[PDB]
């Protein structure tokens, strides 16, 4: 079967590249939507809050 | 995630800027791709009548 | 910007390289098929390639 697939161009490479691009772009979405400030602030002890 | 930072919350203090800075940043947007066309019969059959 | 051009070029190169693929037929050049096999049983090969 591996030999017989070799006569069909690069279908497998195309599919793998497409899926890898998909996998990259979701985590890019996450980094874009969440990480917008590069100073992790520390929660102050809640006492007053008006 | 980034350098740690904390801010001294308190209900009788205010922190105000006293000097500014005019910065300039670049944003890059694609607009259009290469206007491609394809000849069906030529690419699928070359120059054969059959 | 470079990514768009790179992706388009790579896709077109893959499409062109797909021509060198016998798809299980006797040869990857239709002219060879025409010059080698008479029409009565060359249509099967032609149909596979198409
Ligand atoms: C908030 O303001 C009140 C004023 O009534 C004060 O008693 C309290 O100490 C303040 N909280 C601070 C300074 O954390
Ligand atoms: C504000 O920043 C400019 C930028 O160099 C400086 O020349 C000026 O003295 C500053 N003014 C202050 C710190 O009051």
Curated annotation (Swiss-Prot), chain A:
Superkingdom in the source lineage: Viruses
**Mutagenesis / variant outcome for changing residue 48 to H:** In strain: B.1.1.318
Q: What is the effect of changing residue 48 to Y?
A: In strain: 19B/501Y, Omicron/BA.1, Omicron/BA.2, Omicron/BA.2.12.1, Omicron/BA.2.75, Omicron/BA.4, Omicron/BA.5, Omicron/BQ.1.1, Omicron/XBB.1.5, Omicron/EG.5.1
Q: Per its database record, what is this protein's job? A: Precursor of the fusion protein processed in the biosynthesis of the S protein and the formation of virus particle. Mediates fusion of the virion and cellular membranes by functioning as a class I viral fusion protein. Contains two viral fusion peptides that are unmasked after cleavage. The S2/S2' cleavage occurs during virus entry at the cell membrane by host TMPRSS2 or during endocytosis by host CSTL.
The protein's name is Spike protein S2
**Upper lineage:** Viruses, Riboviria, Orthornavirae, Pisuviricota, Pisoniviricetes
Swiss-Prot record, chain C:
The record gives the effect of mutating residue 35 to A as: In strain: Alpha/B.1.1.7
Outcome of swapping residue 34 to F: In strain: Omicron/BA.1
Q: What is the effect of changing residue 7 to H?
A: In strain: Omicron/BA.1, Omicron/BA.2, Omicron/BA.2.12.1, Omicron/BA.2.75, Omicron/BA.4, Omicron/BA.5, Omicron/BQ.1.1, Omicron/XBB.1.5, Omicron/EG.5.1
Where in this chain does the entry annotate a coiled-coil region?
2-46
What does the protein in this record do?
Subunit of the fusion protein that is processed upon entry into the host cell. Mediates fusion of the virion and cellular membranes by functioning as a class I viral fusion protein. Contains a viral fusion peptide that is unmasked after S2 cleavage. This cleavage can occur at the cell membrane by host TMPRSS2 or during endocytosis by host CSTL. In either case, this triggers an extensive and irreversible conformational change that leads to fusion of the viral envelope with the cellular cytoplasmic membrane, releasing viral genomic RNA into the host cell cytoplasm.
Identification of the protein by name: Spike protein S2'
Task: Tell me which species this is from.
Answer: Severe acute respiratory syndrome coronavirus 2
């Amino acid at each position: 079967c591996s030999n017989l697939l070799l006569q069909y161009g690069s279908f497998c490479t195309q599919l793998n590249r497409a899926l890898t691009g998909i996998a990259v772009e979701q985590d890019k979405n996450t980094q874009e939507v969440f990480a917008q400030v590069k100073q992790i602030y520390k929660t102050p002890p809640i006492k007053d809050f008006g | 995630l980034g350098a740690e930072n904390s801010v001294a919350y308190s209900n009788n203090s205010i922190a105000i800027p006293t000097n500014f800075t005019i910065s300039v940043t670049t944003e890059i947007l694609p607009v259009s791709m290469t206007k491609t066309s394809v000849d069906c019969t030529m690419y699928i059959c070359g120059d054969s009548t059959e | 910007l470079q990514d768009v051009v790179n992706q388009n070029a790579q896709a077109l190169n893959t499409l062109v390289k797909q021509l060198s693929s016998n798809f299980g037929a006797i040869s990857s050049v239709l002219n060879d098929i025409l010059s080698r096999l008479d029409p009565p049983e060359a249509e099967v090969q032609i149909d596979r390639l198409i």
